[PDB]
Structure 1
Amino acid sequence: SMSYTWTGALITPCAAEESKLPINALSNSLLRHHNMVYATTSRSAGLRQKKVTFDRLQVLDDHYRDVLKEMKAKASTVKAKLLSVEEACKLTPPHSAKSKFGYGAKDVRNLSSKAVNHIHSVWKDLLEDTVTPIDTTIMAKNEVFCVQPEKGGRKPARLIVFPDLGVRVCEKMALYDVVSTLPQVVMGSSYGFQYSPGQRVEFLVNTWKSKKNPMGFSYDTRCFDSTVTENDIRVEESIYQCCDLAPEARQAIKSLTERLYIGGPLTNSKGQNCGYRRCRASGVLTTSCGNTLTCYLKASAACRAAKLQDCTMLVNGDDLVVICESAGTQEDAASLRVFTEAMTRYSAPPGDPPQPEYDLELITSCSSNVSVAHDASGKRVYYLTRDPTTPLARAAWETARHTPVNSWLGNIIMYAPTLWARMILMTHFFSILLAQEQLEKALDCQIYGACYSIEPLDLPQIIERLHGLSAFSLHSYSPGEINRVASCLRKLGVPPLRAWRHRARNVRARLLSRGGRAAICGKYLFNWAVKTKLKLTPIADLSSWFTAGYSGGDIYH
């Protein structure tokens, strides 16, 4: 069926939309080519609609059924429970989109009588009606990027589809525990959200070394959400139903699946009917879990169809990487086309066709790649990195304009061992925090889709816990990594690394002259900036951060 059907009504904005990076002294000192940084807006929604709208002609085979069978067997061993209205309300982000029935995220978190009553009535409607399509709002996402001349154009805005706040609270009650525990059980080590960046690198390296003649590849599905069929979503529901669940959950899950997940009417911000959706909604609680399960199911089946030897996959939503035994270059090339053919039959054709890679560092998955550096003793240390273009463009944007989400802080946390996060992001932001006396100001940042409130002075502790002490001592980075960073800086007009060193020395001294954690930040985060290095001893439970994915799931921790 068609992923979407449009009426003609436009996807409209609910507020003023900034698209250009304003000229600001603070952001200018980080990146000069401001004209290269932009934010997508509803003005390009039409271009995105055209791409995400198409007919899916899914054909399933024995490989697919066999894998599905094994997945259900593992799901049957999982026991999940309903969340109380209180527990679901507590997971609601402080600034989540307010309901259209006269109450908001604030009312929900505070458990206002009006919020709790509407929630109760929505829940009861789910149990009493498992057919009537639930309404959803379609909006254009505003995200920041850097222009890519070679691409031939700017990126169109992504579309987000989400139901009313009351429905979202009910999703949590019926499914938060399921999406939070089921995937790792069904997928095992292949479930990518159970890993911190370091654990991810460890799994990738160990897996790579476990092959006699390693070969790996990432598979990029073109418009994954749109390729997800009504059958995929119902198969996904059957996997959830294999769990040990309370009658109410079972009923609410069937209802949400039939009324929301498999499709429904699309309404713009003006209240007009934009059309109908018959694919995955980007903005529901099950998006990440459903996508991961679906990608895994299809990729696993396609691995068997292609007869790939000793395969090992790592899946994060639609992000997929496969490492296996090579059979020669020509044979690997033929095997990948077979893999692609199967994925296509399963309704998941490629954006870019997959390419066999024989060097681990050259495999980009989930926009990242493993690279190597050395600690103080000269020992090899593998770590996760990525091209810094987007992180830098977003850092500049967030420096000029106050934003609810601080992607720069998530980037420092996730890519703390990288030379770019250390020399540029840490330096630039601590300099600003010092200037504004906001070192103790807590900030919101997304990690695996979930929202966390983090204090920047806690960075040293967070980084040590997540990456170990080596994150503060890495040096002698690879030639490839060094060149990518250097190239990115010239393109964006970002000052050279040597200039950042000078800035860091100044920032470092200022933090050391201050109290508590500020001195620890100066000592640990900027030890790389001084020749006479201090002794980095262990600093005198972030497990919940890397347990499951929640992208588009309206989760606040």
Structure 2
Amino acid sequence: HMSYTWTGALITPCAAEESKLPINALSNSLLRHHNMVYATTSRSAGLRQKKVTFDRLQVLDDHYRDVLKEMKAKASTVKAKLLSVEEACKLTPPHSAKSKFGYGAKDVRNLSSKAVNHIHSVWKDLLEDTVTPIDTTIMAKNEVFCVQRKPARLIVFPDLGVRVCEKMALYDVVSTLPQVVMGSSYGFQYSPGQRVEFLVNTWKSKKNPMGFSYDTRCFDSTVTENDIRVEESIYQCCDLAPEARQAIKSLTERLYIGGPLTNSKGQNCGYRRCRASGVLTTSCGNTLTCYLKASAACRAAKLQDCTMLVNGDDLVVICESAGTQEDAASLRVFTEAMTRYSAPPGDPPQPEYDLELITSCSSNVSVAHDASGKRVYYLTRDPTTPLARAAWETARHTPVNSWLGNIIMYAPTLWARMILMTHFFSILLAQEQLEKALDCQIYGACYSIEPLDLPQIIERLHGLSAFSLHSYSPGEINRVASCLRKLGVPPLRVWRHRARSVRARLLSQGGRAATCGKYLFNWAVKTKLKLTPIPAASRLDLSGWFVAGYSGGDIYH
């Protein structure tokens, strides 16, 4: 019962891959220790293949089937619609990988007849054939990290035509079902501000709160055929159009449960029997499956008043404490239950008695103070990976601008405000590209965003306090400072100095540029302006934003 079988054909690249940090005239203004930053390449895919390849065994008990019955009871209340071809086509990213069959993402988005004709033929075939495995391309991801080296992650995805049909059958399902089935535990529903609020209120809801993060070793590889059938049975509880049901069963049999792996050069690389990383249902399936198993394991471990927070394969549980020694015992029982369900941990879970000491999705809760002095809670992280990618993006144009994503999702943080906003607005001012829309990612979904609209977006995801936070905590300041020394990034005082320059330059352009200077950089100056609610922030249609996650899902807004 192996996650993968392999032929020995290599996972080949699509193009030239750089492993070393590109340097330009801007590089040393951000980061001087360039040998610390690297990009993963297909060269390391061979190592990743070994890591992700193992036997899965599953022992399913009454807690499991009990939780699944409840999950299905809530699933049965969901009505989901089929998307039209044209609705699905406009959800396709502009630089989504082109079809093998003679069209690309822009053909799809323009509703070109060749594209649409092929998509109708793929759909007709899904309705007619519920057995034939669907081909997938396997590729190494190119992502940037700091040293102390990870191997390349693997992306497995079907043809463009198939991807549009997934949207047609399942987009409304994966968008509406997870909140209904999991309620407040479904993490992708929250803005970062709503998410902190939920965590703190949940932490406060307990008499003696304890919490842990539970992170599964190679989650996609732990997902069995049973797990993918159980997900399908949940989707099928929904009130669906008959073609949707058939297409969902076809996509499950032929794509989701498994299939042949082909490289970029067309060679058969092997065969998948676990989760594909680049299908529509990756995030939702993972979130459901992770919730099912973890809720069941809570019951096996008799944890009092478990609150789950689940996003994909990331899981935090906050529950009632039984004292440190017994909590420790209980976590091992939790871990014992999860492992039996084929979800063992990378690192064993540790109980925590301070909300700020729990880390999941690389992030933790911390505290600062707003204008009035009142404490505000916010999500932050070690800035190392964000900064290493900022350094890469200073010298190379990338299809996803992590700096922009990081400004949006960590806008209230010290390091995003002082370093990322300062640095990238300076570059944008110099190139006169403040109004140029840039592709970025929030919860795995693709967004095209104009840097000038950041103040609006930040106010909506965080509120006006994002522009007013101060008196950050000694622990947080310490981590950032230490990261800046390790990477060879100038100290925070240099950034305050440059921010005043950036601020004045932005004000000197007037308009939306001036708004950016006023709101984003008010922290930089001594005589603080008063920051009132932004007129335009109310106008912005933030629907699609924070209903669900779509990591690997090939979704654009």
- Whether TM exceeds 0.5 here: the answer is yes
Tell me the distance in 2 between the aligned counterparts of 1:351 and 1:371.
Answer: 25
Compute the displacement of 1:377 (Å). Answer: 1.2
Match of 2:173 among 173, 178, 191: 178
Compute the displacement of 1:466 (Å). Answer: 1.5
Question: Alignment length, in residue pairs?
Answer: 550
Percent identity between the aligned chains?
99
Tell me the distance in 1 between the aligned counterparts of 2:380 and 2:170.
Answer: 33
Match of 1:199 among 183, 194, 198: 194
Pair 1:107-2:102 in alignment: no
CA deviation map 1:419-467 (0-9, x unaligned): 0000000000111111111111111111111111111111111111221
Tell me the distance in 1 between the aligned counterparts of 2:23 and 2:281.
Answer: 40
CA deviation map 1:252-301 (0-9, x unaligned): 00000000000000111111111110000000000000000000000000
Tell me the distance in 2 between the aligned counterparts of 1:27 and 1:197.
Answer: 30
Q: State the secondary structure of the residue aligned to 2:440.
A: strand
Q: State the secondary structure of the residue aligned to 1:116.
A: helix
Compute the displacement of 1:542 (Å). Answer: 1.8
Question: Partner of 1:458 in structure 2?
Answer: 453
CA deviation map 1:468-523 (0-9, x unaligned): 11111111011110111011100000000001010001111111111211111111
Compute the displacement of 1:25 (Å). Answer: 2.0
Pair 1:16-2:16 in alignment: yes
Q: State the secondary structure of the residue aligned to 1:275.
A: strand
Tell me the distance in 1 between the aligned counterparts of 2:389 and 2:350.
Answer: 29
Q: State the secondary structure of the residue aligned to 1:266.
A: strand
Pair 1:88-2:88 in alignment: yes
543 and 369 in structure 1: CA distance in 2 versus 1, 3 angstrom threshold: farther
Match of 1:410 among 394, 405, 428: 405
Tell me the distance in 1 between the aligned counterparts of 2:553 and 2:442.
Answer: 12
Compute the displacement of 1:379 (Å). Answer: 0.4
Q: State the secondary structure of the residue aligned to 2:30.
A: coil
Gaps of 5+ in 1: 149-153
CA deviation map 1:43-66 (0-9, x unaligned): 000110100000000110000000
Tell me the distance in 2 between the aligned counterparts of 1:110 and 1:455.
Answer: 22
Pair 1:535-2:524 in alignment: no
CA deviation map 1:106-144 (0-9, x unaligned): 111111111111111110111110001000000000000
Tell me the distance in 2 between the aligned counterparts of 1:518 and 1:111.
Answer: 35
CA deviation map 1:171-216 (0-9, x unaligned): 0000000000000000000000000000010000000011111100
CA deviation map 1:319-366 (0-9, x unaligned): 000001110111000000000000000000010000001111110011
Q: State the secondary structure of the residue aligned to 1:333.
A: helix
Tell me the distance in 1 between the aligned counterparts of 2:273 and 2:57.
Answer: 13
Compute the displacement of 1:23 (Å). Answer: 2.0
Q: State the secondary structure of the residue aligned to 1:487.
A: helix
Once superposed, which parts of structure 1, at least 4 consecutive aligned residues long, lie more than 2 Å away? Answer: none
Tell me the distance in 2 between the aligned counterparts of 1:262 and 1:465.
Answer: 39
Q: State the secondary structure of the residue aligned to 1:198.
A: helix
Tell me the distance in 1 between the aligned counterparts of 2:501 and 2:92.
Answer: 41
Question: Partner of 2:352 in structure 1?
Answer: 357
Q: State the secondary structure of the residue aligned to 2:544.
A: helix
Tell me the distance in 1 between the aligned counterparts of 2:259 and 2:59.
Answer: 23
Q: State the secondary structure of the residue aligned to 1:441.
A: coil
Match of 1:439 among 428, 434, 454: 434
Question: Partner of 2:25 in structure 1?
Answer: 25
Compute the displacement of 1:250 (Å). Answer: 0.2
Compute the displacement of 1:27 (Å). Answer: 2.1
Tell me the distance in 1 between the aligned counterparts of 2:190 and 2:77.
Answer: 22
Tell me the distance in 2 between the aligned counterparts of 1:163 and 1:109.
Answer: 18
Tell me the distance in 2 between the aligned counterparts of 1:177 and 1:380.
Answer: 39
Q: State the secondary structure of the residue aligned to 2:150.
A: coil
In the superposition, the TM-score normalised over structure 2's length comes to 0.98
Q: State the secondary structure of the residue aligned to 1:17.
A: coil
Match of 2:521 among 518, 526, 536: 526
CA deviation map 1:50-101 (0-9, x unaligned): 0000000011000000000000000000000111011111111111111111
CA deviation map 1:364-395 (0-9, x unaligned): 01111110000111101001101000111111
Question: Partner of 1:151 in structure 2?
Answer: none
Tell me the distance in 2 between the aligned counterparts of 1:181 and 1:28.
Answer: 46
Tell me the distance in 2 between the aligned counterparts of 1:543 and 1:188.
Answer: 19
Compute the displacement of 1:28 (Å). Answer: 1.6
Tell me the distance in 2 between the aligned counterparts of 1:553 and 1:470.
Answer: 33
Q: State the secondary structure of the residue aligned to 2:79.
A: coil
Q: State the secondary structure of the residue aligned to 2:31.
A: coil
CA deviation map 1:222-245 (0-9, x unaligned): 000000000000000000000000
Compute the displacement of 1:543 (Å). Answer: 4.0
Q: State the secondary structure of the residue aligned to 1:550.
A: coil
Tell me the distance in 1 between the aligned counterparts of 2:506 and 2:546.
Answer: 30
Q: State the secondary structure of the residue aligned to 2:509.
A: coil
Tell me the distance in 1 between the aligned counterparts of 2:354 and 2:360.
Answer: 13
Question: Partner of 1:47 in structure 2?
Answer: 47
Tell me the distance in 1 between the aligned counterparts of 2:217 and 2:333.
Answer: 17
Tell me the distance in 2 between the aligned counterparts of 1:537 and 1:170.
Answer: 45
Q: State the secondary structure of the residue aligned to 1:179.
A: helix
Question: Partner of 2:537 in structure 1?
Answer: none
Compute the displacement of 1:544 (Å). Answer: 2.3
Tell me the distance in 2 between the aligned counterparts of 1:520 and 1:114.
Answer: 45
Question: Partner of 2:512 in structure 1?
Answer: 517
Tell me the distance in 2 between the aligned counterparts of 1:104 and 1:41.
Answer: 25
Tell me the distance in 1 between the aligned counterparts of 2:530 and 2:81.
Answer: 48
Tell me the distance in 2 between the aligned counterparts of 1:187 and 1:383.
Answer: 24
Tell me the distance in 1 between the aligned counterparts of 2:543 and 2:239.
Answer: 25
Tell me the distance in 1 between the aligned counterparts of 2:113 and 2:465.
Answer: 51
Q: State the secondary structure of the residue aligned to 1:356.
A: coil
Tell me the distance in 2 between the aligned counterparts of 1:88 and 1:251.
Answer: 18
Tell me the distance in 2 between the aligned counterparts of 1:316 and 1:25.
Answer: 39
Compute the displacement of 1:103 (Å). Answer: 0.9
Tell me the distance in 1 between the aligned counterparts of 2:463 and 2:397.
Answer: 31
Compute the displacement of 1:535 (Å). Answer: 1.1
Between 1:245-254 and 1:513-522, the stretch displaced more is: 513-522
Tell me the distance in 2 between the aligned counterparts of 1:27 and 1:243.
Answer: 52
